RNA sequence: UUGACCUCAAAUCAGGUAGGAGUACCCGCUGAACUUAAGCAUAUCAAUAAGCGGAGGAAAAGAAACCAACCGGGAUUGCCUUAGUAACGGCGAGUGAAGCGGCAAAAGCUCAAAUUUGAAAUCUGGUACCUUCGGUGCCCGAGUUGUAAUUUGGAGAGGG
RNA sequence: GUUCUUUGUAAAGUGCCUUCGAAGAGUCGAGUUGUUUGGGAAUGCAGCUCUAAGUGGGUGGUAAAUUCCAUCUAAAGCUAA
RNA sequence: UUGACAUUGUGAAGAGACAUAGUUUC
């Protein structure tokens, strides 16, 4: 009966995911993170819907 | 019908005609065995409003149990414990003498189901009862959409679990504010009330 | 009733266009019946009175109707039934030994 | 997390920061609220004046609900009109057409009078009112309509 | 065991409470199961929806009677009104309740119209068993919401008759309080010979 | 002398049933003390442990002798809440529920008490045959000290 | 989804009119003892004594008398989730 | 152990009251 899960405020859950999305642009960040993107045209990388 | 008369007549227990009957009948019973088969109801109107029916498969037993308090067993009254617990002698027992009645016939007749039971008489020493029983292997019963519920195994020894009406009585099974403790069934409801309930995301 | 339409006071509460429902028979569990009247009247003159009922009408005959109640309230449950019981005895006496 | 906890730091010292002389023992004060009126009375008078004995009347089978009656001050009131609909009424404040506010419907029980509502007329439907509440409302040329 | 300026606590942990700790680890599990059950039922239950038609009903007590809320079943009066008998109504996915009573006409009408809507908006396939298969809508309740009745207009003229609200309450309170006394004054004043 | 009935017996009589086990969970009985109160007896631990009887895949509960006091609700069970609250309590230590509201699931009914009285209309068994979880024919038997149909309070019955 | 026997001079639902309308007792209830409960002039359960009525009866969380009001229909029974 | 109530019924004499008819109590 140890506490295993944790409750985060829904709003602040969103601040973080929003935050996290914004960083997938910022290419320094992406590079920093592992991720081999010196080759890639531009960031955000948007590919066709045909995918 | 005659049962209506019977019913009303049986409510005049201090009436001359009844105290006569009562006096004879209660001596007769006391001569027989403490548990004995009854040829028929001595109260055909009570029996029948209680589920009885005069087809094969329906059985009546007459049993007498001792009256008074439950003398707490224990050697020489010694209680070994706190003083609130030292009582021995004004101690009273939670089921009814009617329950004991059912339970002894029910034992005596394991192949029957106890259906219900009514009071018939008493003196200073015994209360006497007629217990109405059903044979659930009797096809007269097993057929018969109305009584064949009693044929299921959930109804094994109902009297031993307080599922007959007396049992339901002392178990305190009734709706209302007066029955909060004991109603979905006191031990089970107590447990509920002393169960801790922790959620994954703690409330 | 009619409610006043305000939140305190005598006929407190919201005005609603009212209805009054068809009546329940279960609301009539007490009622006599000519069958039950008859049977009961018959059983009575079969079985007669009982010890406390005999003492009761003596007490009425020989000591009034207030001391009759006082005893009958100890005998039976309570004052209301005792009320009702003296009454019944009163009308055994009238009916019988009088008219 | 155990990681940031002071016992990790106390490892290596004899007494776990509970003292050589006075130790850490099972229950020196006794357990619980014990000694309330004796060796723990200094802490209970101060910090908890009023703890022992009784005051008013018992109430068997009190049903909170019976007494349900939230308060709303004139302080707000105008909040119970939706934002856009609101400015509509503040300007063009008049009899003949003044906003109805069902404060019951908004889940309030009594209107109290905390302070200053503009001179717009309102029609105010409530279960109860502060004598001032009603007064102030009237001074803006609105009224109060008692409901249930 | 008393110290500092702390609140007095009340943690009832003096029984063998660790024997009755229910951790809902099975939360996710039960939801899943709960969900499957519903998918079985809807499947089994043919085209019928997963619930029954419930009535509007004004809630009880002083605290909730501003709101209105689904009842249990429709009342023998409402069913009759709506042009069907109880037995049948029960087989058509309408809930009926021999307990509930009608005293408020607004609600009574409400419900009778609730039933009229339903009947028109359902379709009862013949007994024959010929089964013109035709599409399960799952919630009676979704399809026939229960809204709160509109109790006034938005804006309206100010009518101030003069007597204040506050005072009418004090006066009302009063009249009730001394109701008994004044009756005893009037009783006794009769026994003036 | 013969034949019934009532009640009570016997049989290696025809067919069946109960025991014991398991017992996490379920329905009852019975029933502690350690402990806490900084001592202790009421209290507490606890309507707990140990003892006893009884079931099932769940058990129990259940279609109101309910809740309310409202504009009233509407079988039972459970969850979130009500609430560490009303209340109990050497009013000490401690204890401690319910109604409303939201949700999960939903489902409703059976007798007794009634003259079929122009027809016991009901049923166990044996037997033979069959299309065998059963059916029909026939015969013992049950049963009027009442077995069917009809009625269950929401109603409902008889006459028109 | 098909196929065969039509269960029938059988069974059921509904409107009006008239007369009825049977409803559980050593129980309800009461006193007392004991236990139990948050339940407090007594929450349930049990023992012994008393023991009902039928426009009655039970409940309405402060005992009692009086007068009303509200609300159910006990002392028998089945039932999935 | 002692009292009351219940198990508890039937006659006869004697006391006890509506206040010197017999229901009732010893
Ligand atoms: Mg027999
Ligand atoms: Mg002991
Ligand atoms: Mg004790
Ligand atoms: Mg004897
Ligand atoms: Mg409790
Ligand atoms: Mg936390
Ligand atoms: Mg920590
Ligand atoms: Mg760590
Ligand atoms: Mg570290
Ligand atoms: Mg350090
Ligand atoms: Mg250091
Ligand atoms: Mg170190
Ligand atoms: Mg150091
Ligand atoms: Mg330290
Ligand atoms: Mg040390
Ligand atoms: Mg020292
Ligand atoms: Mg305190
Ligand atoms: Mg404010
Ligand atoms: Mg706890
Ligand atoms: Mg688990
Ligand atoms: Mg559903
Ligand atoms: Mg078909
Ligand atoms: Mg044999
Ligand atoms: Mg066994
Ligand atoms: Mg114990
Ligand atoms: Mg321990
Ligand atoms: Mg402890
Ligand atoms: Mg101690
Ligand atoms: Mg100590
Ligand atoms: Mg000690
Ligand atoms: Mg205790
Ligand atoms: Mg045990
Ligand atoms: Mg099994
Ligand atoms: Mg099953
Ligand atoms: Mg299940
Ligand atoms: Mg069951
Ligand atoms: Mg049951
Ligand atoms: Mg009913
Ligand atoms: Mg309910
Ligand atoms: Mg405290
Ligand atoms: Mg306790
Ligand atoms: Mg709810
Ligand atoms: Mg069913
Ligand atoms: Mg009944
Ligand atoms: Mg006990
Ligand atoms: Mg008690
Ligand atoms: Mg009273
Ligand atoms: Mg109602
Ligand atoms: Mg039955």
Swiss-Prot record, chain A:
Entry PTM: N-terminally acetylated by acetyltransferase NatA.
Note: There are 2 genes for uL4 in yeast.
Assembly and interaction partners: Component of the large ribosomal subunit (LSU). Mature yeast ribosomes consist of a small (40S) and a large (60S) subunit. The 40S small subunit contains 1 molecule of ribosomal RNA (18S rRNA) and 33 different proteins (encoded by 57 genes). The large 60S subunit contains 3 rRNA molecules (25S, 5.8S and 5S rRNA) and 46 different proteins (encoded by 81 genes). uL4 is associated with the polypeptide exit tunnel. uL4 interacts with its chaperone ACL4 and the nuclear import receptor KAP104.
Subcellular location: Cytoplasm; Nucleus
Taxonomy, superkingdom: Eukaryota
Signal peptide (residue range): none
Species of origin: Saccharomyces cerevisiae (strain ATCC 204508 / S288c) (Baker's yeast)
Stated role: Component of the ribosome, a large ribonucleoprotein complex responsible for the synthesis of proteins in the cell. The small ribosomal subunit (SSU) binds messenger RNAs (mRNAs) and translates the encoded message by selecting cognate aminoacyl-transfer RNA (tRNA) molecules. The large subunit (LSU) contains the ribosomal catalytic site termed the peptidyl transferase center (PTC), which catalyzes the formation of peptide bonds, thereby polymerizing the amino acids delivered by tRNAs into a polypeptide chain.
Family membership noted in the UniProt record: Belongs to the universal ribosomal protein uL4 family.
From Swiss-Prot, chain B:
PANTHER family recorded: LARGE RIBOSOMAL SUBUNIT PROTEIN EL15, RIBOSOMAL PROTEIN L15
Sorted UniProt keywords: Cytoplasm, Ribonucleoprotein, Ribosomal protein
One of the record's GO cellular component terms: cytosolic large ribosomal subunit
Localization terms from the record: Cytoplasm
Protein name: Large ribosomal subunit protein eL15A
Gene3D superfamilies recorded: Ribosomal protein l15e
GO biological process, alphabetically ordered: cytoplasmic translation
Domain of life, per lineage: Eukaryota
Subunit details: Component of the large ribosomal subunit (LSU). Mature yeast ribosomes consist of a small (40S) and a large (60S) subunit. The 40S small subunit contains 1 molecule of ribosomal RNA (18S rRNA) and 33 different proteins (encoded by 57 genes). The large 60S subunit contains 3 rRNA molecules (25S, 5.8S and 5S rRNA) and 46 different proteins (encoded by 81 genes).
SUPFAM superfamilies per UniProt: Ribosomal proteins S24e, L23 and L15e
Species annotation: Saccharomyces cerevisiae (strain ATCC 204508 / S288c)
Predominant location: cytoplasm
InterPro entries per record: Rbsml_eL15_core_dom_sf, Ribosomal_eL15, Ribosomal_eL15_CS, Ribosomal_uL23/eL15/eS24_sf
Region annotation Disordered: where it falls in the sequence: 163-184
Biased composition (Basic residues): 168-184
Keyword Ion transport in annotation: no
Gene name of the encoded protein: RPL15A
Similarity remark: Belongs to the eukaryotic ribosomal protein eL15 family.
A GO molecular function held by the record: structural constituent of ribosome
Note, other: There are 2 genes for eL15 in yeast.
UniProtKB/Swiss-Prot annotation, chain C:
Keyword ATP-binding: no
InterPro entries on file: Ribosomal_eL36, Ribosomal_eL36_sf
Superkingdom per UniProt: Eukaryota
PTM notes: N-terminally acetylated by acetyltransferase NatA.
Primary localisation category: cytoplasm
Cell location: Cytoplasm
PTM-bearing positions, type N-acetylthreonine: 1
A GO CC term attached to the entry: cytosol
Classification via Pfam families: Ribosomal_L36e (PF01158)
GO molecular function: RNA binding; structural constituent of ribosome
Subunit structure: Component of the large ribosomal subunit (LSU). Mature yeast ribosomes consist of a small (40S) and a large (60S) subunit. The 40S small subunit contains 1 molecule of ribosomal RNA (18S rRNA) and 33 different proteins (encoded by 57 genes). The large 60S subunit contains 3 rRNA molecules (25S, 5.8S and 5S rRNA) and 46 different proteins (encoded by 81 genes).
Note: Present with 31600 molecules/cell in log phase SD medium. There are 2 genes for eL36 in yeast.
Protein name (database record): Large ribosomal subunit protein eL36A
UniProtKB/Swiss-Prot annotation, chain E:
PROSITE patterns hit by this protein: RIBOSOMAL_L13E
Protein name from the UniProt record: Large ribosomal subunit protein eL13A
GO MF annotation list: RNA binding; structural constituent of ribosome
Keywords, alphabetical: Cytoplasm, Phosphoprotein, Ribonucleoprotein, Ribosomal protein
Subunit record text: Component of the large ribosomal subunit (LSU). Mature yeast ribosomes consist of a small (40S) and a large (60S) subunit. The 40S small subunit contains 1 molecule of ribosomal RNA (18S rRNA) and 33 different proteins (encoded by 57 genes). The large 60S subunit contains 3 rRNA molecules (25S, 5.8S and 5S rRNA) and 46 different proteins (encoded by 81 genes).
Pfam families given in the database record: Ribosomal_L13e
GO BP terms: cytoplasmic translation
Other notes: Present with 133000 molecules/cell in log phase SD medium.
PANTHER family: 60S RIBOSOMAL PROTEIN L13, LARGE RIBOSOMAL SUBUNIT PROTEIN EL13
One GO cellular component term: cytosol
Keyword DNA-binding: no
Annotated family: Belongs to the eukaryotic ribosomal protein eL13 family.
Gene: RPL13A
Gene3D superfamilies: 1.20.5.110
Signal peptide: none
């Amino acid at each position: 009966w140890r506490k295993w899960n944790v409750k985060v405020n829904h709003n602040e859950k969103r601040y973080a995911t929003a935050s996290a999305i914004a960083a997938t642009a910022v290419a320094s960040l992406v590079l920093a993170r592992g991720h081999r993107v010196e080759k890639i045209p531009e960031i955000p990388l948007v590919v066709s819907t045909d995918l | 019908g005659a049962y209506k008369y019977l019913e009303e007549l049986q409510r005049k227990k201090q009436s001359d005609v009844l105290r006569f009957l009562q006096r004879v009948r209660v001596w007769e019973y006391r001569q027989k065995n403490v548990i004995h088969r009854a040829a028929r109801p001595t109260r055909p109107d009570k029996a029948r409003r209680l589920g009885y029916k005069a087809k094969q498969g329906f059985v009546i037993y007459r049993v007498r149990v001792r009256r008074g308090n439950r003398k707490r067993p224990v050697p020489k009254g010694a209680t070994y414990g706190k003083p609130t617990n030292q009582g021995v002698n004004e101690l009273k027992y939670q089921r009814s003498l009617r329950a004991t009645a059912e339970e002894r016939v029910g034992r005596r007749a394991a192949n029957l189901r106890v259906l219900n039971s009514y009071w018939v008489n008493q003196d200073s020493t015994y209360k006497y009862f007629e217990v109405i029983l059903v044979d659930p292997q009797h096809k007269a019963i097993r057929r018969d959409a109305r009584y064949n519920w009693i044929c299921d195994p959930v109804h094994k020894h109902r009297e031993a679990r307080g599922l007959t009406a007396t049992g339901k009585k002392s178990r305190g099974i009734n709706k209302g504010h007066k029955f909060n403790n004991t109603k979905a069934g006191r031990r089970k409801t107590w447990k509920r009330q002393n169960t801790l309930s922790l959620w994954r995301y703690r409330k | 009733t009619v409610k006043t339409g305000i939140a305190i006071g005598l006929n407190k509460g919201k005005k609603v266009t009212s209805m009054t429902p068809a009546p329940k028979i279960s609301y009539k569990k007490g009622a006599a019946s000519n069958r039950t009247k008859f049977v009961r009247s018959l059983v009575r003159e079969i079985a007669g009175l009982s010890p406390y009922e005999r003492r009761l009408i003596d007490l009425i005959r020989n000591s009034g109707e207030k001391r009759a109640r006082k005893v009958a309230k100890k005998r039976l449950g309570s004052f209301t039934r005792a009320k009702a019981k003296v009454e019944e005895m009163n009308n055994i006496i009238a009916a019988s030994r009088r008219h | 997390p155990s990681r940031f906890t002071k016992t990790r730091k106390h490892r290596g010292h004899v007494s776990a920061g509970k003292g050589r002389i006075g130790k850490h023992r099972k229950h020196p004060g006794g357990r619980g609220m014990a000694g309330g009126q004796h060796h723990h009375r200094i802490n209970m008078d101060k910090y908890h004046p009023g703890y022992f004995g009784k005051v008013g009347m018992r109430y068997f089978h009190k049903q909170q609900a019976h007494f349900w009656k939230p308060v709303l001050n004139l302080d707000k009131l105008w909040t119970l009109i939706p934002e856009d609909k609101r400015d509509q009424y503040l300007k063009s404040a008049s009899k003949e057409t003044a906003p109805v506010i069902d404060t019951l419907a908004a889940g309030y029980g009594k209107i109290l009078g905390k302070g200053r509502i503009p001179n717009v007329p309102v029609i105010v439907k409530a279960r109860f009112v502060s004598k001032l509440a009603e007064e102030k409302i009237r001074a803006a040329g609105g009224v109060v309509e008692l409901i249930a | 065991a008393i110290s500092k300026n702390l609140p007095i606590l009340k943690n009832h942990f003096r029984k063998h409470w660790q024997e009755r700790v229910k951790v809902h680890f099975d939360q996710a599990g039960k939801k899943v199961s709960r969900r499957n059950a519903r998918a079985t039922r809807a499947a089994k239950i043919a085209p019928r929806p997963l619930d029954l038609l419930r009535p509007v009903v004004r809630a009880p007590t002083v605290k909730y009677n501003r709101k209105v809320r689904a009842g249990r079943g429709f009342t023998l009066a409402e069913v009759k009104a709506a042009g069907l008998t109880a037995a049948y109504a029960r087989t058509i996915g309408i809930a009926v309740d021999h307990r509930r009573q009608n005293r408020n006409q607004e609600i009574f009408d409400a419900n009778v119209q609730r039933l009229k809507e339903y009947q028109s908006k359902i379709i009862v396939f013949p007994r024959n068993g010929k089964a013109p298969e035709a599409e399960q809508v799952l919630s009676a309740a979704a399809t026939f919401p229960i809204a709160q009745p509109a109790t006034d207009v938005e804006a309206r003229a100010v009518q101030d008759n003069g007597e204040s609200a506050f005072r009418t309450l004090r006066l009302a309170r009063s009249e009730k309080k001394f109701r008994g006394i004044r009756e005893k004054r009037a009783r006794e004043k009769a026994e003036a010979e």
